C-alpha cells in the first residue's frame, strides 16, 4: 500500500504536488524524514 | 566503555547533555551530521532536562 | 554475516559493485548519506572495476 498527497479533481496543484513528491523522493528527503521521526526520535536506540 | 559520540548516540542507558546556553548546544543545533542530529534530537526531547 | 549497507561499507574483505550504467550507480553517485557516500567512493576507486 502507499500513502499519497491528495488534491481535488481538476485542481491546479495536482501536477506540481506530484512532481514535488517525486523530487523529494529522489533527493532522499522522504527517507531522511522517515529516519528523523521514527528512529532519530526513537526511545529504544539501535 | 563509550569511546566516541556514536557510542553515546546508539545507546539509551547513559544520558547526556550540554550547558543550557553556549557554543556546544548551538553546534549540536546547527549540525548536519547524522549522529549529531540524533544526539540533538535526544537532548532536545529529553525529559527531565 | 553482512546484514546491512553499513556492514558492507565498514569492512574491506568483501568487494561490492553494481552495473556499469543503471539506476543504482546514479543513486550511489548522487547520494548524500554518509554510508552511501563511502560506498560510492569505494566503488569509484576500486580496481579492477
From Swiss-Prot, chain A:
**Which residues are in coiled coils?**
none
The compartments listed are: Cell membrane; Postsynaptic cell membrane; Postsynaptic density membrane
Q: What else is known?
A: The postsynaptic actions of Glu are mediated by a variety of receptors that are named according to their selective agonists. This receptor binds AMPA (quisqualate) > glutamate > kainate.
Q: What does this protein do?
A: Ionotropic glutamate receptor that functions as a ligand-gated cation channel, gated by L-glutamate and glutamatergic agonists such as alpha-amino-3-hydroxy-5-methyl-4-isoxazolepropionic acid (AMPA), quisqualic acid, and kainic acid. L-glutamate acts as an excitatory neurotransmitter at many synapses in the central nervous system and plays an important role in fast excitatory synaptic transmission by inducing long-term potentiation.
Which family would the database say this protein is a member of? Belongs to the glutamate-gated ion channel (TC 1.A.10.1) family. GRIA3 subfamily.
Self-association and partners: Homotetramer or heterotetramer of pore-forming glutamate receptor subunits. Tetramers may be formed by the dimerization of dimers. Interacts with PICK1, GRIP1 and GRIP2. Found in a complex with GRIA1, GRIA2, GRIA4, CNIH2, CNIH3, CACNG2, CACNG3, CACNG4, CACNG5, CACNG7 and CACNG8. Interacts with CACNG5. Found in a complex with GRIA1, GRIA2, GRIA4, DLG4, CACNG8 and CNIH2.
Q: Output this protein's name.
A: Glutamate receptor 3
Curated annotation (Swiss-Prot), chains B, C:
The residues listed in the UniProt record as binding L-glutamate, with positions renumbered to this chain, are 23-24
Could you tell me where this protein is found in the cell?
Cell membrane; Postsynaptic cell membrane; Postsynaptic density membrane
Misc remark for this entry? The postsynaptic actions of Glu are mediated by a variety of receptors that are named according to their selective agonists. This receptor binds AMPA (quisqualate) > glutamate > kainate.
- What assembly does the database describe for this protein? Homotetramer or heterotetramer of pore-forming glutamate receptor subunits. Tetramers may be formed by the dimerization of dimers. Interacts with PICK1, GRIP1 and GRIP2. Found in a complex with GRIA1, GRIA2, GRIA4, CNIH2, CNIH3, CACNG2, CACNG3, CACNG4, CACNG5, CACNG7 and CACNG8. Interacts with CACNG5. Found in a complex with GRIA1, GRIA2, GRIA4, DLG4, CACNG8 and CNIH2.
Q: Which family does it belong to?
A: Belongs to the glutamate-gated ion channel (TC 1.A.10.1) family. GRIA3 subfamily.
Function field: Ionotropic glutamate receptor that functions as a ligand-gated cation channel, gated by L-glutamate and glutamatergic agonists such as alpha-amino-3-hydroxy-5-methyl-4-isoxazolepropionic acid (AMPA), quisqualic acid, and kainic acid. L-glutamate acts as an excitatory neurotransmitter at many synapses in the central nervous system and plays an important role in fast excitatory synaptic transmission by inducing long-term potentiation.
Q: What is this protein called?
A: Glutamate receptor 3
Instruction: Report where the shown chain sits in the full-length sequence: first residue, last residue, total length.
Output: 658 to 706 of 888
